[PDB]
Design a protein around this ligand. Structure first.
Ligand SMILES: CC(C)NC(=O)c1ccc(C#Cc2ccncc2)cn1
Ligand SMILES: CC(C)NC(=O)c1ccc(C#Cc2ccncc2)cn1
Ligand SMILES: [Cl-]
Lengths: 306, 306
């Protein structure tokens, strides 16, 4: 029993982390096969970040300008190219620790594990969610750019996030491994503000199912509701609209616990209108929305990865 | 910026996890050098756990009774012995992935990263704290026993916890890697209840310093207090007494932020007496006490591990 914010095992990703240095800028890169992926702002200085022209800046860069280091061994760069907002540094040595992997662009609401790095060395691992406004609430300091977010299913590492920027409000923005930013953010130090931080309704419901599975049932009520009526309350409290797809996705949890999805919605409705009354749910005094129905099932069933 | 519950990189520990099977019982073991460590209740059935005599049960066990498996390769056991509540299965092959490591018995209030496993395969990683009542609030299901808690400093893995039991209240109990239980718990399915779950005061203060560092300052007040007067309030709310040692340990954070430790105590006092008033601190609606002063400094400074 017990429910905890749980990241995937990071061993497979640790072995792909390298340090990329371009001039006076150092950040982390992802070494898969014979290619190193890193944020393209590695080629920028601090003054360049206000208004960079990346195509022009890259003209002054050759293969030997990109210093790639793994441990105390230095990778030979035999080619480089810019794809959207990442650079692909072709090296001459295939990473012997390349795991089975994919590049996946996640949707808002999905979760992933972040391996925060500095100078190509791992610092820690934590669980994140792509917010509806396409930011993430991470823990990143100077030099963390290049750190990746990922998921693991059995033996395949699905890379979905690369860290790029920290917005003036403290939240974080990045790209997929193809260099396309999540949301409307650019790799420029300009005025770009995050939108409304809506709550992932389907994830709160999955987390409430996990609470029931683990003994916390005080929040269960005697009411039910309809998707439309509940969504009227969700709008008021800045909750993402619940769709029939979300209901179907919660089916497995509904069956295991015997609590209809709309019954749980009515319980959530009361919590949004009346609060927690100083109580807690799975050790939290607020409604957690960074557990997917997939995460709850996986943690509550003991899925492993080899 | 941003502060997140952060576990150490688990790659070094993943490579030491094996599966130990004894009869019909399977659990995880820690393979360091040519020795495998696992909970001694692996030799027990479900009916044996009510009142086991481990010395007698082990007489019916030989080396070949202990099935140790790493991946799809099976370790040859050439010796076995019982140390407190763990078994040491001497194998004939030194783990080629043995990291630099130590066995450390942590004190209540200290934190560590847990690598939850099942059948010797990692499932996830999360951060835990040894509670003052010597339990931990983890996420463990059947077959997780053997999963270890650890810390990492640069290249040395300090193993401090091995999972053993889940108490009827949902919290978890285990031993150090020498087989001595934390607290008064035994590896018996008997009536043993956890004590008062006191709050780790020094950790709440470190977490409040981390909030200030990251922009959350609404809780800062105009008052100060003395260690004695604050402890009068700490007793009321079941908070561990704050000692001069705790003050000295918070020194580095006090210097970086310019907020005297006793000033922060007075701010905590108001929070305990008046609550949060529906506000949040670093995304939490309650006072977090599973960050040590050491964790805050490490995450806020970007310490890495190689
Ligand atoms: C205008 C001038 C003063 N610029 C600076 O000095 C400057 C700009 C940006 C950053 C940064 C960063 C970061 C990125 C991702 N995650 C965490 C942190 C540091 N320093
Ligand atoms: C009396 C009889 C019904 N016993 C059982 O079936 C029985 C006892 C104990 C467990 C367990 C466990 C566990 C340990 C550590 N972490 C998580 C879970 C499962 N099953
Ligand atoms: Cl909370």
């Amino acid at each position: 029993s017990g429910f905890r914010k749980m990241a995937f095992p990071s061993g497979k990703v640790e072995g792909c982390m390298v340090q990329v240095t371009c001039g006076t800028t150092t950040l982390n890169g992802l070494w898969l096969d014979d290619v190193v992926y890193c944020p393209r702002h590695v080629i920028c200085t601090s003054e360049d970040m206000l208004n960079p022209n990346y195509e022009d800046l890259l003209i002054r860069k050759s293969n030997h300008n990109f210093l790639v280091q793994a441990g105390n061994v230095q990778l030979r760069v035999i080619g480089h190219s810019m794809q959207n907002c990442v650079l692909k540094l072709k090296v001459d040595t295939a990473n012997p620790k390349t795991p089975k992997y994919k590049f996946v662009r996640i949707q808002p609401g999905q979760t992933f594990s972040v391996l925060a790095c500095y100078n190509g060395s791992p610092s820690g691992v934590y669980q994140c969610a792509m917010r509806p406004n396409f930011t993430i609430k991470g823990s990143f300091l100077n030099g963390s750019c290049g750190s990746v977010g990922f998921n693991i299913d059995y033996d395949c590492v699905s890379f979905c996030y690369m860290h790029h920027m920290e917005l003036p409000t403290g939240v974080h923005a990045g790209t997929d491994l193809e260099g396309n930013f999540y949301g409307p953010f650019v790799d420029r130090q300009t005025a770009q503000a995050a939108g409304t931080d809506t709550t992932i309704t389907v994830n709160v419901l999955a987390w409430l199912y996990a609470a029931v599975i683990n003994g916390d049932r005080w929040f269960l009520n005697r009411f039910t509701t309809t998707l439309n009526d509940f969504n009227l309350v969700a709008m008021k409290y800045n909750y993402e609209p619940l769709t029939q797809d979300h209901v179907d996705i919660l089916g497995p949890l509904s069956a295991q616990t015997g609590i209809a999805v709309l019954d749980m919605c009515a319980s959530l409705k009361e919590l949004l209108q009346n609060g927690m009354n100083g109580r807690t749910i799975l050790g939290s005094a607020l409604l957690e929305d960074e557990f997917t129905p997939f995460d709850v099932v996986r943690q509550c069933s003991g899925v492993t990865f080899q």
